[PDB]
Amino acid sequence: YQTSNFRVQPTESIVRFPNITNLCPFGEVFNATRFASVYAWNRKRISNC
Amino acid sequence: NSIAIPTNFTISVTTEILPVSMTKTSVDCTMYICGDSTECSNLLLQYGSF
Numbered sequence: 001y002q003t004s005n006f007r008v009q010p011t012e013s014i015v016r017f018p019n020i021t022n023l024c025p026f027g028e029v030f031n032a033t034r035f036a037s038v039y040a041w042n043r044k045r046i047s048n049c
Numbered sequence: 050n051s052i053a054i055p056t057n058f059t060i061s062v063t064t065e066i067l068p069v070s071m072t073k074t075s076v077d078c079t080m081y082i083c084g085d086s087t088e089c090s091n092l093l094l095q096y097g098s099f
């Protein structure tokens with residue numbers, strides 16, 4: 001006589017993303033020798049990393 | 050008067066198909082609709098009778 005199923009799930013699940021960033025040198029933008037003025041604030045993008 | 054009788058014949062053994070069974074899928078409700086979701090099964094158990 002059918003009793004029930006069993007929705008097993010050992011060690012839940014694993015979350016995986018690719019290897020570490022590539023072309024994200026945040027240091028030279030944030031530890032830069034060259035900063036900007038407040039009215040002349042710079043604008044540079046970070047992308048694909 | 051007229052008739053038609055075969056002098057000889059043939060044994061035309063051929064195909065014939067009568068599909069017997071299917072996939073007796075015992076599709077449950079609390080998991081098919083609600084996979085790893087206590088919320089979905091909670092909502093579906095009051096439907097119940099379905």
Ligand SMILES: *[C@@H]1O[C@H](CO[C@@H]2O[C@@H](C)[C@@H](O)[C@@H](O)[C@@H]2O)[C@@H](O[C@@H]2O[C@H](CO)[C@@H](O[C@@H]3O[C@H](CO)[C@@H](O)[C@H](O)[C@@H]3O)[C@H](O)[C@H]2NC(C)=O)[C@H](O)[C@H]1NC(C)=O
Nearest residue numbers: 051052053054055056057058059060061062063064065066
């Ligand atoms: C009715 O038809 C059969 C055979 O018919 C064939 O098979 C059917 C399933 C259908 O596909 C038909 O379209 C197809 O033609 C006749 O049988 C034949 O009989 C003759 C002799 O009566 C056989 O000849 C033989 O020859 C060897 C050679 O050495 C001799 O040694 C034998 O003693 C014999 O004489 C023949 O092989 C056989 N099969 C054929 C022709 O395919 C059947 O005779 C016919 N009925 C009448 C009344 O004609």
